[PDB]
């Protein structure tokens, strides 16, 4: 069967400022088939409030989803996105890097 690997992007909605409420995004695109697991992590723990977009796909038929939550960037809290898919041997964790 066709399988395509998710392309994972973890980023803030707005330029981050410590102590200032913002939105944390994990955008996963280009995957097939559609079954995927996506978590946002704060200090390695799953964020339970996370919302996601309704399943859609691109002209090449690959799927995309946005996972998002409110968050407050700080000096010491670590944010990440963890993704699992049939194409990945084990979950892939991508850390948020605010200095990109």
């Amino acid at each position: 069967m066709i399988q395509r690997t998710p392309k994972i992007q973890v980023y803030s909605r707005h330029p981050a400022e410590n102590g200032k409420s913002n939105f944390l995004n994990c955008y996963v695109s280009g995957f097939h088939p559609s079954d995927i697991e996506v978590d946002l992590l704060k200090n390695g723990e799953r964020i339970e409030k996370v919302e996601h977009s309704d399943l859609s796909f691109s002209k090449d038929w690959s799927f995309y989803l946005l996972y998002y939550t409110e968050f407050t960037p700080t000096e010491k809290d670590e944010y990440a996105c963890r993704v699992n898919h049939v194409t990945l041997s084990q979950p892939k964790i991508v850390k948020w890097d605010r200095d990109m």
Binding site: M1, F23, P33, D35, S53, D54, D99
Partner: protein, 275 residues
Amino acid sequence: GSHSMRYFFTSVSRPGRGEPRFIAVGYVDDTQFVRFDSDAASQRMEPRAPWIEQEGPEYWDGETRKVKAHSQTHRVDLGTLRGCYNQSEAGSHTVQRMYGCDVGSDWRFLRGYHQYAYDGKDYIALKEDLRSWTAADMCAQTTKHKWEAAHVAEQLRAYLEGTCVEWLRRYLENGKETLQRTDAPKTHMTHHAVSDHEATLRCWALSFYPAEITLTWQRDGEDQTQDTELVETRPAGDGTFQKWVAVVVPSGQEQRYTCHVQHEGLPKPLTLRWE
């Protein structure tokens, strides 16, 4: 600006774990406005953009009836396709369908689409003339025979050129504050030293609408697309989009590298420099 309306349907078999999952979404340009999810409690077509909320009960009942009818045809399609490809009953498979219409700046018909995939591969598509089909594999040619004999293309063409365009016009008007806007990208480049001898240059476009944009790097005026890391254009969450493009360069050569941004919000193509 040109505009589109598209519906995207995804049907996934899950043998022994329920009836197939069915998800439908509707978009105008890059803005989602409705959804259906067969696993959700409501069993209704639901609003996903503020400007569709105003539609009356005939609308929600009608779209609900249509989307359920489409879920049922795709449920039976999963069986037809498993049979044709002689696939096991145990495995999960995917049917996708996309259709809709494009109009120009003047809201007149440009093009229509109606096309299908099975397990992530093109299956059958209506050609641009809306009169003929593209079907590569033999299973899809069988479908094509059936759809030719049933004059399916003619029915689809009538929707795409007529009703589709009417709905697109209504939504664009109801949603005009959102949909008929341009937000020019806020652009900048970042520099980060990866080591003592190389640096990552990243060219940013933020808070732009619509999604179409071009970001490219040049080195002394020579296009660097082969050496550039270009990420997929991504939603900010607020109805604007973001994108970046990066090159890794030898430290000290930054002044040779320029980023070029094209967007309909920009009066002129922008060049960003290190200077």
